[PDB]
DNA sequence: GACCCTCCCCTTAGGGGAGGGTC
DNA sequence: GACCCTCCCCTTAGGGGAGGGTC
């Protein structure tokens with residue numbers, strides 16, 4: 001007996017003719033006979049048994065050369081191979097569900113931002129804690145901070161989270177500033193999203209957090225005239241209420257879009273904790 | 276401002292020069308300036324912000340054209356995109372953990388086989404239940420059964436499990452046969468491995484099982500002289516003990532290897548239930 | 551007519567060269 | 574010397590043709 005044409009076989013095993021032809025090319029699964037005159041491929045019924053494995057292995061996802069060597073193994077030998085495949089699967093799963101969580105949180109963070117009570121206005125609210133990696137900003141003012149200034153931070157973040165946080169942060173001493181050049185950042189930082197142990201972290205990186213507590217905040221969209229005014233707004237709010245400050249000012253800058261085809265726009269949030 | 280060479284940027288963002296050049300080719304991320312004389316690529320510090328997304332999206336796994344259109348979205352628009360990515364992740368996870376289970380079981384099944392008390396000898400043992408898909412074998416004897424005879428079964432199996440079961444089964448009426456040609460199969464079947472609802476199953480397929488209970492069994496490696504003798508061995512074992520049979524004889528044939536480079540060998544197991 | 555053939559271009563996201571300027 | 578350039582071949586597992594026999 002009983003001989004199948006490539007088509008017959010295709011229908012039979014549910015494998016594309018192109019597939020079979022290919023698996024012939026790579027000598028993974030060759031027809032039992034090839035008519036020398038017409039180059040036609042013809043297969044034996046007993047032969048189909050091999051596709052059982054080729055197909056299974058394909059479903060798992062093992063690459064073809066891999067199959068080519070796996071098909072040699074005797075049952076004992078193979079069992080092992082299968083346990084290997086298992087661990088690889090669990091690796092993926094671990095990675096994927098990590099990825100599931102981070103996103104959920106990226107969305108949670110991204111949402112609080114799209115639902116902020118109002119812009120250019122100062123609001124006081126109960127905040128949740130936010131872990132971050134920070135580093136001394138060596139006499140670095142909002143005047144000359146660079147993206148390049150964040151690179152090492154972004155490295156450790158990238159390794160741990162895998163997912164470069166949109167957010168850029170810096171903090172400074174809450175003072176009755178009168179102009180931007182009096183301002184200098186104390187540390188700069190990037191919120192961390194993950195609990196994977198950071199690998200091989202250097203000692204110039206403090207892992208620390210923006211504690212939970214009451215924050216006087218303000219959020220707006222960036223425009224230079226506006227930046228210092230909003231600051232002033234905050235200092236005023238606090239001054240009027242007599243409220244007592246207990247942290248630096250936290251500044252967070254997050255893009256609204258990443259289109260290089262449109263004018264770049266950013267969101268800014270200054271937070272500060274009170275009693 | 277402050278201008279970076281492709282190298283500077285590479286080091287800075289941890290992205291390969293080849294990557295950047297490519298992302299330039301596809302107009303996903305182009306340098307701010309290209310020296311017309313030396314075709315050198317040069318980038319602005321403010322520009323790096325875009326790789327934040329490109330890199331994140333890459334980690335998730337979204338394809339490049341995809342990114343190209345995602346980078347246009349404003350925050351609201353994007354949030355949605357992220358929820359999309361989420362569901363896709365959960366799809367994968369579901370699939371993967373299904374795959375995790377099936378393998379564990381493929382291994383469990385494969386193991387009982389490598390640890391069978393002895394060959395060509397009849398053993399009586401307490402068996403666990405085994406679900407299967409079967410179908411009337413229309414006057415089909417062990418004499419002329421084909422692999423092609425199993426194709427539809429293998430289809431439904433493939434769809435549900437995704438993983439073509441190694442095992443081939445057939446059953447027949449327990450009789451004091453005297454020769455192979457008196458033997459005809461009643462049904463033929465393939466063990467099922469999964470609980471995914473079988474899709475659109477036809478009515479000529481019975482989903483049914485090999486019940487748990489006590490089985491007189493025998494297992495050996497295929498050789499024609501041996502096949503009928505082993506059968507006879509079984510009939511004798513039962514005859515001597517007077518034991519009372521309550522099912523067909525179940526025959527299972529499973530290859531020991533799938534190498535086309537070696538002589539094909541199979542394992543056979545005849546089981547039968549008693550009281 | 552329906553089924554098979556070989557050979558060619560096609561996709562992804564670059565890596566690793568070789569061959570040649572340019573900092 | 575170290576850094577950048579363009580252009581070319583390379584990988585995976587085939588799918589979708591066009592152009593031509595052959596069942």
Ligand SMILES: CC(=O)OCC[N+](C)(C)C
Nearest residue numbers: 142145146168169170253
């Ligand atoms: C995003 C950007 O414009 O630069 C990052 C510095 N920061 C935090 C002052 C805004």
Ligand SMILES: CC(=O)OCC[N+](C)(C)C
Nearest residue numbers: 417420421443444445528
């Ligand atoms: C695997 C093989 O030789 O054919 C399948 C039929 N059966 C069950 C009689 C062996």
